[PDB]
């Protein structure tokens, strides 16, 4: 038995398609399972979206107050629904997008990056600027959750998104002050306790960004650190197209995939 066999058993048991990527390190070979197959972003895009906004603006831009109306709420928006008559700062929008998967926050940051009709092109462009030729965002929240299996629209691959997240958190895509804001928001995420976090021991640091969609889509992208501070990137993506558009996502699948990864990365000699 090897790791690919373990992953295939998860697929069988959950009636799911699973994608896993952990980039190679100095000490470890890449872990990959369907890593070049396409999966819908869902809200995993919101992490590189926040990076794009951070990168293109000075820090004082995070204090810029953005006004919107009930006309702009089209999606699950746990934070923005609360502030729709008053408005929210860019920094508050980044916070909401990452820590609560707020659709409206994401959509507003898309507009901040690219203007009214240009947000998705611009977000995709940011990824192209990082050397990611693979991913693409074509719709805003909530429509980006709804493309059918095999549609290339609104998709990344585990390989591509992990390599983006690596540049953002563990490379120099952002200067340290901006990088630290992105890291802190992901570290404070409220939506990921049952995904990659659940697969890693408590003394490993985990920051993450989840996504959940139609056809039982459930994703999580994380950066993890060993108790001594050795960092790894983990992308786990899944869907359950056999149940149709309303298939139940299964977070436990992601927790188990992450548990498999954690056992490779932690167990020594």
Quickly list DSSP for 66-102: E---GGG--S--TTGGGGTTT-EEHHHHHHHHHHH--
Residues in the chain: 269
**Alpha-carbon 29 to chain mean position:** 23
CA–CA distance from 157 to each of 39, 100, 209 (Å)?
Answer: 6, 23, 15
Retrieve residue 169's tokens.
């958190």
Q: Count CB-CB contacts under 10 A for residue 8.
A: 12
> Which strand (E) or helix (H) includes residue 156?
strand 155-156
The H or E element containing residue 126 is helix 119-129
* Partner residues linked to 235 by β-bridges: 21, 221
Q: C-alpha angle 194/195/200, rounded to 5°?
A: 95
- The structure tokens listed for 212 are 């959940």
Q: Does the CA dihedral 69-70-76-80 come out positive or negative?
A: positive
Which structural technique was applied? X-ray
**CA nearest 46: which of 123, 116, 111?**
123
Domains in the chain: how many in total? 1
> In whole angstroms, what is the distance from residue 84 CA to residue 106 CA?
14
CATH code of residue 226: 3.40.710.10
Q: Which residue range forms the structural domain that includes residue 243? A: 1-269
Nearby residues of 201 by Cβ (< 8 Å), 6 or more positions away: 262, 266
């Amino acid at each position: 038995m090897d790791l690919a066999d373990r992953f295939a058993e998860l697929e069988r048991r959950y009636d799911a398609r699973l994608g896993v990527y952990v980039p190679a390190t100095g000490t470890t070979a890449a872990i990959e399972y369907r890593a070049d197959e396409r999966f819908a972003f869902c809200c995993t895009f919101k992490a590189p979206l926040v990076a794009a906004v951070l990168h293109q603006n000075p820090l004082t831009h995070l204090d810029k107050l953005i006004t919107y109306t009930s006309d702009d709420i089209r999606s699950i928006s746990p934070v923005a629904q609360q502030h729709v008559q008053t408005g929210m700062t860019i920094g508050q929008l980044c916070d909401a997008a990452i820590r609560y998967s707020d659709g409206t926050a994401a959509n507003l940051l898309l507009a901040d990056l690219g203007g009214p009709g240009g947000g998705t092109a611009a977000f995709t462009g940011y990824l192209r600027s990082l050397g990611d030729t693979v991913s693409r965002l074509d719709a805003e929240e909530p429509e980006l959750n709804r493309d059918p299996p095999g549609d290339e629209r609104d998709t990344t691959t585990p390989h591509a998104i992990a390599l983006v997240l690596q540049q953002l958190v563990l490379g120099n895509a952002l200067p340290p002050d901006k990088r630290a804001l992105l890291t802190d928001w992901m570290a404070r995420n409220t939506t990921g306790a049952k995904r990659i976090r659940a697969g890693f021991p408590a003394d490993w640091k985990v920051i993450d960004k989840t996504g959940t969609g139609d056809y039982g889509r459930a994703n999580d992208i994380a950066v993890v650190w060993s108790p001594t501070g050795v960092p790894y990137v983990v992308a786990v993506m899944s869907d359950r197209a056999g149940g149709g558009y309303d298939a139940e996502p299964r977070e436990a699948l992601l927790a188990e995939a992450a548990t498999c990864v954690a056992g490779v990365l932690a167990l020594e000699h």
